[PDB]
């Protein structure tokens, strides 16, 4: 899960500006898409796969003379041990698909059950042996919001040129409907709520409360 | 963060009035335009493109 | 500001082709590494 | 120009009416832990 | 009746008090996807009140400077 | 005792301020918040 | 106290005889009757209580239980097709426009809630008047996504717009299951494939990937179908979400979508592997997705001086079923050459994680 | 008190007693937007120079927008 942050990470980079007055905006879109393709190639090579130790201080382990018959070697890392043991369980077709233990596995495991899960098999196997990019991504997302602000002011004044009668009545109604919201919490301030001046709808409320 | 109804409603009015009082030519906002176009970022950035474009030719 | 448009246009036009060049070259190198890995 | 706007946000609000409406709570005169002492002393005196 | 006299220090009218105009409102949360991801969503909007690029402007004017 | 009843009024009339006050109920953002509280998480499958 | 002269409220015939429900209309009939009356400031209460009963007791106001509800709600939903037609200029200019826009958004969220339980979505898909509205909203949001000049947002109204998409998209999640396309050029799929490439928010990306996944079931891949409108520009993005190793929800949604995209026929597999920017991702992500958040044996003894894992995550399970289905493609299709180029890397993940040997049975029997 | 009034008159009569005000007193712009909101009201039948002024300011904001984009190109 991705961690939530306290600052905006990206911006939409609006596209309602006239593409015949402001130029090179398509250049910006091409550059952003190219950077979006220049890191999909990096994240891929961060999950890169490598095959460097099929067979090839605590990285080297001496195997027992018993397990040395299922490996072909007497020393090597633990990775080679678990891998070659799995390869031996796979080549001889021992998994039940119609693990069924072989004859030499009886000795290497010191078990006569002749049938054991693979989990226990590898259990016995063990038993036998960066900062500047954040500033750049905040500086860029600090300009695509300034662009997203100037574009909004252009959108407002351009939509004011066309239909000014429609925008002005909206501004006057937003004003007459927002100056009322901001003047709704000036009644409770602890220096005008104990002076008995606002207690002489705070009277029908006590009727509803007492009934409640 | 930590925005509320009052902090948002008082921000919408500030944005509407900054524009309306600018239509009436009552607001002077030259100390805000002298942060985008007038600073040397309009010329020094071009003086950085004038050399990056030439570095990109070899 | 038109000089800015001409310069940004030329710089972007040149950078896109440079990146596609050093992008296809890297893809070719990855293909050679692929066959050199499957052989091993 | 009777209105001057700057890059900051406090002066921009101060120029307009909204100046004091960006606070989470209105200022107080009876929340001071000293004023309440004086009022309690006057009440105890009466 | 064991009603405290006004000399005692319980007396204060509002110490902790929240008005609905001061309630926190749901807004767009911003997510971080490593440092080499430019195709990630980087937003999460479930029906918030601003639910747009206005929250970015609010962060830009108040906390961006 | 008076300052313990003027506290229940102001704490039972401020909470009920988005369902009673006209100019505060039918505004944008308040309605959006009220709808946002009742979203009902989507059925995964 | 209790006397006739004091008050005439119990004389001899009504003091315990009136029923217990004689106090007015019931809380449901009151909602239903105050919803068709024309008085405002009253609809704003009915559509508030219906909005409450759609998140605290939806089984009580289900469309099937009351076959007279959608006729009422459409009276508030349909005017949005006219209001949304605006929102590129100043369309809200008084206190009666917002009163008809919020009364519509509430009636839309109520349907979005009642369209989550089963045997209630079976009523929206029958009425074309709602599917047409959803298509209209998706068309407008496609115009916003593409960037054409025929329709502009007028950002000052985005507050009212971005709350309509996050409801119609949620109406599409429950509707896309009940439909299955059979034609190439078809709406409800070109719009989603256009929005997904732009939406830039996790909630919409996941809701779209789930809707697209549900728009491909009950179909066969041997003829023209909706699966032919997308190309190597969108499939080169849904598979790119596998590279995002920072979450366990985009990866699951992408693997689920690919598993639903591959199911029918074998030509889908040949098409998915055509590009050289989608096979290179699956080749270098599907091995690593079988050990995603699985607590590897932690081989660190090479610098010092094993506890092999026991279970597997949900992403490893989905990627396992993905390789299972890709295993039995053909002896010549790219579905087998892929599973053959992945064998020397799935082997290490089988050696380090035991419980895969039971889940990767079908993948191993086919190689 | 005997009882000749509603049960709710005593609650308000007790809540509205000015018994601490006598002891509290012993111890202890926006004008422009009140007239602009009516100057616009009177401006609202030609509205020609209003649109011409709006277009003249849009020509400035589309320029500062072009400058912001001209800088975002360098940062990218």
Swiss-Prot record, chain A:
Query: What are the transmembrane regions?
Result: none
Subcellular location field: Nucleus
Top-level taxon of origin = Eukaryota
Hey, which family's this protein in?
To yeast SNF12.
User: What is the protein's quaternary organization?
Assistant: Interacts directly with RSC8. Component of the two forms of the RSC complex composed of at least either RSC1 or RSC2, and ARP7, ARP9, LDB7, NPL6, RSC3, RSC30, RSC4, RSC58, RSC6, RSC8, RSC9, SFH1, STH1, HTL1 and probably RTT102. The complexes interact with histone and histone variant components of centromeric chromatin.
Q: Please share what else the UniProt entry notes about this protein.
A: Present with 2470 molecules/cell in log phase SD medium.
Purpose of the protein: Component of the chromatin structure-remodeling complex (RSC), which is involved in transcription regulation and nucleosome positioning. RSC is responsible for the transfer of a histone octamer from a nucleosome core particle to naked DNA. The reaction requires ATP and involves an activated RSC-nucleosome intermediate. Remodeling reaction also involves DNA translocation, DNA twist and conformational change.
The protein in question is named: Chromatin structure-remodeling complex protein RSC6
Name the lineage. Answer: Eukaryota, Fungi, Dikarya, Ascomycota, Saccharomycotina
From Swiss-Prot, chain E:
The name under which this protein is listed is Chromatin structure-remodeling complex protein RSC58
The shown range, given as first to last of full length, is 252 to 316 of 502
All disulfide bonds of the chain are none
Its assembly, as annotated, is: Component of the two forms of the RSC complex composed of at least either RSC1 or RSC2, and ARP7, ARP9, LDB7, NPL6, RSC3, RSC30, RSC4, RSC58, RSC6, RSC8, RSC9, SFH1, STH1, HTL1 and probably RTT102. The complexes interact with histone and histone variant components of centromeric chromatin.
Q: Where in the cell is it found?
A: Nucleus
Q: What else is known?
A: Present with 4460 molecules/cell in log phase SD medium.
Function, please? Answer: Component of the chromatin structure-remodeling complex (RSC), which is involved in transcription regulation and nucleosome positioning. RSC is responsible for the transfer of a histone octamer from a nucleosome core particle to naked DNA. The reaction requires ATP and involves an activated RSC-nucleosome intermediate. Remodeling reaction also involves DNA translocation, DNA twist and conformational change.
Per the record, the gene is RSC58
From Swiss-Prot, chain F:
Localization per record: Nucleus
- From what superkingdom does this record's organism come? Eukaryota
Q: What else is known?
A: Present with 1990 molecules/cell in log phase SD medium.
State what this protein does.
Catalytic component of the chromatin structure-remodeling complex (RSC), which is involved in transcription regulation and nucleosome positioning. RSC is responsible for the transfer of a histone octamer from a nucleosome core particle to naked DNA. The reaction requires ATP and involves an activated RSC-nucleosome intermediate. Remodeling reaction also involves DNA translocation, DNA twist and conformational change.
> What's the subunit arrangement here?
Interacts directly with SFH1, CSE4, histones H3, H4 and H2B, and via its N-terminus, with RSC8. Interacts with LDB7, NPL6 and RTT102. Component of the two forms of the RSC complex composed of at least either RSC1 or RSC2, and ARP7, ARP9, LDB7, NPL6, RSC3, RSC30, RSC4, RSC58, RSC6, RSC8, RSC9, SFH1, STH1, HTL1 and probably RTT102. The complexes interact with histone and histone variant components of centromeric chromatin.
- Please state which protein family the record places this protein in: Belongs to the SNF2/RAD54 helicase family.
Q: What is this protein called?
A: Nuclear protein STH1/NPS1
Question: What organism does this protein naturally occur in?
Answer: Saccharomyces cerevisiae (strain ATCC 204508 / S288c) (Baker's yeast)
Q: Report the portion of the entire protein shown.
A: 253 to 297 of 1359
Curated annotation (Swiss-Prot), chain G:
Q: Which GO terms describe its molecular function?
A: DNA binding
Any further remark recorded for this protein: Present with 2610 molecules/cell in log phase SD medium.
Q: Which GO terms describe its cellular component?
A: chromatin; RSC-type complex
Asked if the record carries the keyword Nucleus, the reply is yes
Kindly state the subunit structure of this protein: Component of the two forms of the RSC complex composed of at least either RSC1 or RSC2, and ARP7, ARP9, LDB7, NPL6, RSC3, RSC30, RSC4, RSC58, RSC6, RSC8, RSC9, SFH1, STH1, HTL1 and probably RTT102. The complexes interact with histone and histone variant components of centromeric chromatin.
One BP annotation, GO: rRNA transcription
PROSITE patterns (alphabetical): RFX_DBD
- The domain of life for this entry's organism is Eukaryota
Q: What does this protein do?
A: Component of the chromatin structure-remodeling complex (RSC), which is involved in transcription regulation and nucleosome positioning. RSC is responsible for the transfer of a histone octamer from a nucleosome core particle to naked DNA. The reaction requires ATP and involves an activated RSC-nucleosome intermediate. Remodeling reaction also involves DNA translocation, DNA twist and conformational change.
Query: Which family does the similarity line name?
Result: Belongs to the RSC9 family.
Q: What is this protein called?
A: Chromatin structure-remodeling complex subunit RSC9
List locations, semicolon-separated.
Nucleus
Keywords assigned: Chromatin regulator, Nucleus, Phosphoprotein, Transcription, Transcription regulation
């Amino acid at each position: 899960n991705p961690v939530p942050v306290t600052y905006p990470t990206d911006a939409y980079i609006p596209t309602y500006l006239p593409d015949d007055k402001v130029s090179n905006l398509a250049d910006l879109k091409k550059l952003i898409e190219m950077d979006s393709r220049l890191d999909l190639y990096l994240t891929r090579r961060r999950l890169d796969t490598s095959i460097n130790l099929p067979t090839n201080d605590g990285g080297k382990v001496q195997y027992s003379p018993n397990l040395a018959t299922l490996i072909g070697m007497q020393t090597g890392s633990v990775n080679d041990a678990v891998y070659s043991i799995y390869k031996y369980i796979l080549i001889n077709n021992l998994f039940v698909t119609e693990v069924k233990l072989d004859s030499l596995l009886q000795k290497v495991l010191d078990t006569n059950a002749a049938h054991l899960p693979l989990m226990n098999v590898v259990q016995t196997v063990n038993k036998l042996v960066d900062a500047e990019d954040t500033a750049k991504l905040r500086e860029i997302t600090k300009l695509a919001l300034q662009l997203n602000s100037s574009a909004q002011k252009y959108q407002f004044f351009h939509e004011l040129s066309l239909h000014p009668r429609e925008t002005l009545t909206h501004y006057l109604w937003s004003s007459k409907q927002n100056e009322l919201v901001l003047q709704g919490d000036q009644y409770f301030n602890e220096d005008a709520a104990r002076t008995s001046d606002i207690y002489s709808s705070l009277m029908g409320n006590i009727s509803l409360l007492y009934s409640q | 963060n930590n925005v509320t109804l009052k902090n948002l409603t008082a921000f919408q009015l500030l944005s509407q009035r900054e524009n309306i009082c600018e239509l009436l030519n009552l607001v002077e906002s030259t100390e805000r335009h002298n942060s985008i176009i007038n600073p040397e970022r309009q010329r020094m950035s071009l003086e950085e493109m004038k050399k990056m474009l030439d570095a990109l030719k070899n | 500001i038109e000089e800015s448009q001409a310069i940004i246009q030329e710089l972007v036009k040149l950078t896109m082709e440079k990146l596609e060049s050093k992008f296809t070259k890297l893809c070719d190198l990855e293909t050679q590494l692929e066959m050199e890995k499957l052989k091993y | 120009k009777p209105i001057k706007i700057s890059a900051d946000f406090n002066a921009k609000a101060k120029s307009l009416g909204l100046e004091s409406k960006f606070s989470n709570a209105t200022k107080t005169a009876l929340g001071d832990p000293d004023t309440e002492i004086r009022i309690s002393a006057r009440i105890s005196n009466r | 009746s064991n009603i405290p006299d006004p000399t005692l220090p319980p007396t204060e009218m509002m110490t902790r008090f929240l008005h609905p105009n001061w309630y926190a409102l749901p807004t767009t949360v911003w997510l971080k996807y490593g440092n080499y991801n430019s195709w990630a969503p980087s937003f999460n909007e479930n029906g918030t009140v601003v639910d747009s690029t206005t929250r970015g402007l609010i962060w830009l004017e108040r906390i961006g400077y | 005792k008076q300052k313990s009843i003027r506290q229940k009024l102001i704490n039972n009339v401020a909470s009920q301020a988005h369902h009673n006050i006209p100019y505060l109920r039918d505004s944008p953002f308040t309605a959006a918040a009220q709808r946002s509280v009742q979203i009902r998480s989507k059925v995964i499958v | 106290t209790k006397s006739i002269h004091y008050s005439l409220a119990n004389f001899n015939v009504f003091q315990s005889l009136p029923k217990e429900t004689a106090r007015g209309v019931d809380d449901l009939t009151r909602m239903e009757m105050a919803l068709l009356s024309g008085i405002p400031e009253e609809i704003k209460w009915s559509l508030k209580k219906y909005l409450t009963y759609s998140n605290k007791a939806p089984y009580m106001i289900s469309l099937r239980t009351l076959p007279d509800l959608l006729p009422l709600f459409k009276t508030f939903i349909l005017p949005l097709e006219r209001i949304v037609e605006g929102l590129n200029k100043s369309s809200i200019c008084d206190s009666k426009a917002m009163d008809s826009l919020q009364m519509g958004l509430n009636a839309l969220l109520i349907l979005r809630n009642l369209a989550q339980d089963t045997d209630s979505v079976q009523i929206l898909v029958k009425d074309r008047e709602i599917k047409s509205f959803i298509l209209f909203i998706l068309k407008k949001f496609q115009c916003v996504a593409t960037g054409d000049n025929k329709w502009q947002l007028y950002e000052g109204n985005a507050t009212f717009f971005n709350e309509l998409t996050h409801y119609t998209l949620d109406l599409m999640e429950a509707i896309s299951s009940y439909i299955a396309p059979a034609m190439k050029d078809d709406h409800y799929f070109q719009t989603l494939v256009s929005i997904l490439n732009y939406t830039k928010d996790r909630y919409m990306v996941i809701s779209i990937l789930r809707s697209l996944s549900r728009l491909l079931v009950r179909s066969k891949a041997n003829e023209e179908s909706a699966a032919d409108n997308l190309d190597h520009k969108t499939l080169s993005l849904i598979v790119s979400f596998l590279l995002l190793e920072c979450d366990s929800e985009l990866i699951i949604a992408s693997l689920d979508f690919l598993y639903q995209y591959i199911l029918p026929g074998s030509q889908r597999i040949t098409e998915l592997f055509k590009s050289k920017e989608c096979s290179l991702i699956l080749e270098a992500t599907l091995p690593n997705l079988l050990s995603y958040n699985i607590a590897t044996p932690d081989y660190h003894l090479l610098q010092k001086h094993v506890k092999f894992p026991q279970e597997l995550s949900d992403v490893s399970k989905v990627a396992c079923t993905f390789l299972c289905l890709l295993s039995n493609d053909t002896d010549d299709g790219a579905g087998s050459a892929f599973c053959q180029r992945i064998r020397p890397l799935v082997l290490h993940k089988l050696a380090d994680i035991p419980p895969l040997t039971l889940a990767l049975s079908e993948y191993m029997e086919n190689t | 008190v005997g009882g000749h009034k509603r049960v709710e008159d005593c609650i308000e009569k007790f809540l509205s007693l000015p018994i601490e005000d006598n002891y509290i007193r012993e111890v202890v712009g926006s004008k422009l937007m009140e007239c602009v909101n009516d100057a616009v009201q009177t401006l609202l039948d030609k509205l020609g120079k209003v649109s011409d002024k709006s277009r003249e300011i849009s020509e400035k904001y589309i320029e500062e927008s072009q400058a912001i984009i001209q800088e975002l190109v360098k940062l990218t």
